[PDB]
Amino acid sequence: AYIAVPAVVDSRSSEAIGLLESFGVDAGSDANDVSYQDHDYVVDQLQYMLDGYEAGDVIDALVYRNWLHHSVYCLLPPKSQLLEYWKSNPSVIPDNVDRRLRKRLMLKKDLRKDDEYNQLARAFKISDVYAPLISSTTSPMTMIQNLNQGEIVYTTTDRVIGARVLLYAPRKYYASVPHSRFNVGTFPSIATPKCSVMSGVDIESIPNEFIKLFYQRVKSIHANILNDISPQIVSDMINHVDVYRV
């Protein structure tokens, strides 16, 4: 199961604060099955990705995510530093790469000016070697689709949303989770039949203003197909103290 709440859910602190007695849920017991999810980085990625793309595209893409399906990005350095990494420590080379390109990268020549290797690198593109490659111009709907189907996704950029970003090469070549049957977290989805949203909190009172924008946009387009459940229904289904937060 999956439940979405109007708040930044986290697996570290949201258990300490609870958030369920916060919204008014009577989860208090030896429950230990309402496992939270990490959406801090997802909110940060949403903020960073609204900077270049358009809000409608980004939100309507992020709504179709299956948060109970683990996955992850991992970005590749550009083609030049990529080839430099192919060469040094060459025993990581995928087999898709051209036979000629591998036979020329396996050589210990200085490669100062190899008249044919320059052509072989010019006609080389990243998209053919690594199959799921998102884009520099992905038009993000395929991003969420590829996160839904598969375990690892290959990007050439940083503007991505949905999962964490992992490094492919060492840092030189760049510039400067179990389930629990009651998973919860922000950012509602309609991926499965068991995704629910907790109603009972007005839209104009949401304080984060990015969760707020997401909820307004998703609820004005998917009103008739979302599963609303009140705090009482959630309670029946389940069954450094910060000051200045009341």
Binding site: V97, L120, D128, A131
Partner: protein, 1087 residues
């Protein structure tokens, strides 16, 4: 040391003497299967899964039930408990033999009152208890717990059962009673006797420390006639020569017999149940010669099994069953899946690994790498076909699970359907003007024919068509879809293009290569076939939609020899590869479809296609010759046997598109409740494979350079038949079929279904059980049978998923043209259900012995000094609906108070209002609907007034309170307690108040009684004043002579029993002693 029979090597003589027993030779266990080869010294044996050390021993993972269980104690199920003790003077006190005194021992309790109870296996000495005991306390105790187990989850009263479920509880009780007596009598030793009353008789002796303590209980005539008592009258009426052993076998095992018939204390019911169980087991007996035949035939002629044995008759090893039973099993196994891929994953994967282990085929992509090692391209030419196909085939990767899983999926066409993965098709449909898409098409077309997807050919054709859009056009059948519809989407017969089945609509001038590809598909697509396996004459067969000995295959097979040309284009798969390569050459030759290729690549493409065509693979040879052989060798040994559906090449009108399971009978119309199998788009659960891996495995494969098939397959077949459990799965199929028939009978017994059950218990009250109630009842029955046969695996689990009120099973699929094939296994008889109906038969006549009373009760004061025993009333105290001056009250009973001194009144059924006096007739339902309001208006009238109510019981448990008939006694406390404790969901045991018999004159004190039965329920009473010459006051009762027919009746044959009306005691029992040797074999290699 060594056994000259099986040629095994032994170490100690105590080991040889215990080893020859498995062959059947006597001398002067832990193993369940003992095999030994002949070309090597390496025996293999199996042990149970609780064997605590598998020290060079294998395991039985099958949840095999326990069919053969033995009993050494006597075989009765009815105690005789004393209720009111007594002690009386006697003339004779003991016997004397020159100096000695032997105390008189009586077969029955010498008490003032003795009656029968029901304690299953109270004198049994078992080696494995079923634990389905039905233990009943004496009537003076409270037996209400026996009738509040099933559906009395929340009854307020801790004691008190729901009257609406007596029938369900009694049915479960009878099931437990039958299921707890499923044993097999032993053959304990004897002892010559010389007592003055039992001369020269041979008396059985129970196993234990001392055995003479049981002789008095077992042989009632052993006691003499020393006194003037009721027991002495009984023994003087009995005959004497019916005692001890009666008849013994002619076959002897040393100095002891093989079986015997003995007179002793027992009951006709349990002797009959155990006789029927013994007959059921004996009908399954098998022969080591037959095991030899079946294994030699399953081996397909690569090894020969031999199991010698000595000539013996008392050997039992039940393994023979019917195809109907195995089919019912397979149907339940198919229900188990329920579209859950986790249940079907390990089957396919483990079978794939087993094939990989026992196959001679080896796969190395270095063949492809070597053949491409010479093709190279000149610098300044940036397009290389050889490099492209190498990079797209990935010869470095060595994961070929797709190939073996595709092979293993041929056996399971009906449950799982394998399809090529969506990501294997060209991106965005592809184009003929693209080298990568050309090689993608090559891989795809070469990998498609190995999948069980019903529409592979249409997918291949439309892959090429989609690539061919813009250069060639085929006609479309409607205005919606176009030639560029994606080839993934053609996954059901209703999408096959109308120009695909009729080639002539593809004009050769407008689409020449598409027409060529179509003709190639129609002509050279592989043809299905079929091969024999198993041994239907001994093991049977679990085939449902195929004859019981064939194994369908999506390709053709031939007799196997290794001296085959590596490249013969009469082979299906090799000819297919050659045809595909030729067609791609025809596509590439003229450059009519690749405008934009500046460089000429015809020579390079033709060179690489020639190399790919004339390759040195032996995978087609393997798949044609040796793969079907080892599939048929593996098939009969699998836990979940093959469940196939017919393979059809291109006959669209008979393509299977739906597999369903039926649960109701044929002459009924109910809710259309389709099983979950019928919700798949394909015929089964879809499964995606890898075209790249299948093509690489099919394109690079070789044998060992010193192969000898006889040696290879002997060595591969010995270890895996040494670890067989077909013989356990057969017994489990027996138990499954028995359980299915039993559940059907019992659930029809309470619900409403058209199934005929003969309805032996209709007087016990109950309700029209709904889906949930019937399902919980069936859950209790299921768990009871599991507990009795010691099972932890599923059994009847899928049948409990919604509306268990079933009538019979059936499985069926339907072709595309609308025809359906309905297969209905003819379920044979079931010994368990037959015995349950027999015990219901005996219950209908003797229900009192289980603590039930029939009829209804009559509440109302009766004061007098008479001693008439309220369980057997005289006629003038009972009234019924036909009695003049009686009022009957329905549900509409409304009370009105009388004003100003007028009496209150209640509403008759006919509308009349009547006072609180006379004779009434309630259903129990009214008083149970509102016990509160009722026993505030009626108590003062029933207690001291003239009211007298007859509550309509049906069935009711009872409890006895014996009082002294020479003192005051008043049952109002018990009566009022019962009436107050009754509640809308439960009723406590009806408390009666019975006097005590006496063998002497007594005074008479007034007794006041408020509850009396309406018919004779005093049937469990055995005897009163057993040790006195007669009974002078109170309910009289002598020893029931009709329960000792063969003793007291002179003209009664020794095996005569009047079973349905009265359960006899002191029957004739048959005692056995069998041997259950393990499965032994001697595998012999074939030259």
């Amino acid at each position: 040391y060594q056994c000259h029979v099986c040629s095994a090597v032994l170490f100690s003589p105590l080991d040889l003497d215990a080893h020859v027993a498995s062959h059947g030779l006597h001398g002067n266990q832990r193993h369940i299967t003992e095999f030994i080869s002949s070309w090597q010294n390496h025996p293999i044996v199996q042990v149970s899964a609780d064997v605590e050390n598998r020290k060079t021993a294998q395991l039985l993972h099958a949840d095999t039930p326990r069919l053969v269980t033995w009993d050494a104690g006597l075989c009765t199920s009815f105690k005789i408990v004393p209720i009111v003790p007594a002690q009386v003077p006697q003339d004779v006190l003991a016997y004397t033999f020159f100096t000695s005194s032997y105390a008189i021992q009586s077969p029955f309790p010498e008490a003032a009152v003795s009656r029968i109870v029901v304690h299953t296996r109270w004198a049994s000495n078992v080696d494995f208890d079923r634990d389905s005991s039905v233990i009943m306390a004496p009537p003076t105790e409270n037996n209400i717990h026996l009738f509040k187990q099933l559906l009395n989850t929340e009854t307020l009263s801790v004691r008190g059962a729901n009257p609406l479920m007596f029938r369900a509880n009694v049915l479960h009780m009878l099931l437990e009673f039958v299921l707890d007596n499923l044993y097999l009598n032993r053959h304990t030793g004897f002892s010559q006797d010389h007592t003055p009353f039992t001369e020269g008789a041979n008396l059985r002796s129970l196993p234990g420390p001392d055995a003479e303590k049981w002789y008095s209980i077992m042989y009632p005539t052993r006691m003499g006639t020393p006194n003037v008592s009721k027991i002495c009258n009984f023994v003087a009426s009995c005959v004497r020569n019916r005692v001890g052993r009666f008849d013994r076998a002619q076959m002897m095992n040393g100095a002891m017999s093989e079986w015997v018939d003995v007179f002793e204390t027992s009951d006709a019911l349990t002797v009959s149940i155990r006789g029927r169980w013994m007959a059921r087991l004996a009908r399954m007996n098998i022969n080591p010669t037959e095991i030899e035949w079946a294994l030699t035939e399953c081996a397909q002629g690569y090894v020969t099994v031999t199991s010698p044995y000595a000539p013996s008759v008392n050997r039992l090893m039940p393994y023979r069953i019917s195809n109907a039973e195995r089919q019912i099993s397979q149907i339940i196994r198919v229900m188990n899946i329920g579209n859950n891929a986790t249940v079907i994953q390990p089957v396919l994967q483990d079978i794939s690994v087993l094939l990989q282990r026992i196959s001679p085929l080896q796969i190395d992509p270095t063949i492809i790498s070597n053949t491409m090692s010479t093709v190279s391209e000149s610098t300044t030419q940036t397009l290389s076909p050889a490099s492209s196909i190498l990079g797209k085939l990935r010869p470095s990767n060595s994961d070929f699970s797709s190939f073996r899983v595709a092979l293993a999926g041929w056996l399971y066409n009906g449950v799982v359907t394998t399809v090529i993965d969506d990501s294997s098709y060209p991106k965005d449909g592809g184009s003929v003007t693209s080298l990568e898409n050309l090689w993608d098409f090559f891989i795809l077309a070469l990998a498609l024919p190995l999948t069980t997807d019903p529409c592979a050919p249409v997918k291949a054709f439309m892959t090429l068509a989609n690539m061919m859009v813009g250069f060639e056009t085929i006609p479309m059948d409607n205005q919606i879809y176009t030639q560029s519809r994606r080839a993934s989407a053609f996954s059901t017969p209703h999408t096959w293009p109308r120009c695909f089945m009729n080639i002539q609509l593809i004009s050769p001038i407008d689409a020449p290569i598409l027409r060529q590809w179509a003709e190639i598909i129609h002509r050279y697509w592989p043809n299905p076939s079929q091969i024999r396996y198993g041994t239907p004459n001994v093991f049977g067969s679990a085939n449902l939609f195929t004859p019981p000995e064939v194994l369908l295959l999506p390709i053709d097979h031939q007799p196997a020899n290794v001296t085959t040309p590596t490249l013969d284009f009469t082979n299906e798969l090799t000819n297919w590869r050659a045809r595909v390569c030729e067609l791609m050459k025809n596509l590439v030759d003229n450059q009519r479809y690749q405008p934009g290729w500046t460089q000429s690549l015809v020579s390079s493409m033709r060179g690489t296609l020639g190399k790919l065509k004339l390759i040195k693979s032996m995978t087609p040879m393997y798949l044609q010759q040796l793969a079907p052989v080892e599939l048929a060798v593996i098939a009969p040994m699998l836990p979940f046997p093959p469940f196939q559906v017919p393979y059809v090449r291109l006959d669209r009108d008979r393509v299977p598109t739906m597999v369903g399971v039926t649960r109701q009978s044929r002459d009924t119309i109910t809710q259309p409740a389709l099983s979950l199998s019928t919700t798949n788009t394909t015929v089964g659960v879809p499964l995606a494979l890898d075209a790249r891996a299948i093509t690489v495995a099919l394109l690079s494969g070789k044998y060992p350079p010193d192969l000898v098939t006889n040696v290879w397959y002997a060595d591969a077949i010995y270890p895996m038949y040494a670890d067989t459990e077909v013989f356990s799965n057969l017994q489990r199929d027996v138990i499954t079929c028995e359980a299915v028939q039993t559940l059907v009978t019992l659930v029809a017994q309470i619900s409403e279904t058209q199934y005929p059950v003969d309805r032996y218990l209709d007087w016990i009250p109950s309700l029209r059980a709904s889906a949930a109630t019937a399902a919980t009842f069936a859950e209790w029955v299921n768990t009871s049978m599991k507990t009795a046969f010691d099972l932890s695996d599923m059994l009847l689990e899928p049948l409990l998923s919604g509306d268990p009120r079933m009538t019979q099973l059936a499985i069926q699929y339907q072709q595309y043209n609308g025809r359906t094939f309905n297969v209905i296994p003819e379920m044979p008889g079931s010994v368990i259900a037959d015995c349950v109906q027999l015990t219901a038969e005996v219950f209908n006549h003797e229900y009192n012995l289980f603590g039930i009373a029939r009829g209804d009760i009559i509440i109302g004061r009766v004061q007098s000094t008479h001693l008439w025993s309220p369980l057997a009333p005289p006629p003038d105290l009972v009234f019924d609906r036909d009695t003049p001056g009686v009022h009957i009250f329905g549900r509409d009973c409304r009370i009105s108070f009388g004003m100003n001194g007028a009496a209150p009144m209640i509403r008759d059924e006919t509308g009349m209002m009547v006072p609180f006096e006379g004779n009434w007739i309630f259903p129990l339902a009214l008083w149970q609907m509102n016990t509160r309001y009722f026993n505030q208006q009626f108590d003062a009238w029933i207690k001291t007034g003239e009211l007298r109510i007859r509550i309509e019981m049906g069935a009711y448990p009872y409890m006895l309170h014996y009082y002294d008939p020479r003192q005051y006694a008043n049952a109002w406390n018990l009566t009022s307690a019962w009436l107050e404790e009754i509640t809308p969901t439960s009723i406590p045991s009806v408390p009666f108040m019975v006097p005590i018999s006496s063998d002497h004159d007594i005074s008479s004190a007034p007794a006041v009684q408020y509850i009396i039965s309406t018919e004779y329920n005093d049937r469990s009473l055995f005897c009163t004043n057993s040790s006195s010459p007669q009974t002078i006051a109170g309910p009289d009762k002598h020893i029931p002579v009709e329960r000792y027919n063969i003793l007291t009746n002179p003209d009664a044959p020794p095996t005569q029993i009047q079973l349905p009306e009265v359960v006899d005691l002191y029957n004739v029992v048959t005692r056995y002693a069998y041997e259950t040797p393990p499965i032994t074999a001697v595998v012999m290699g074939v030259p």
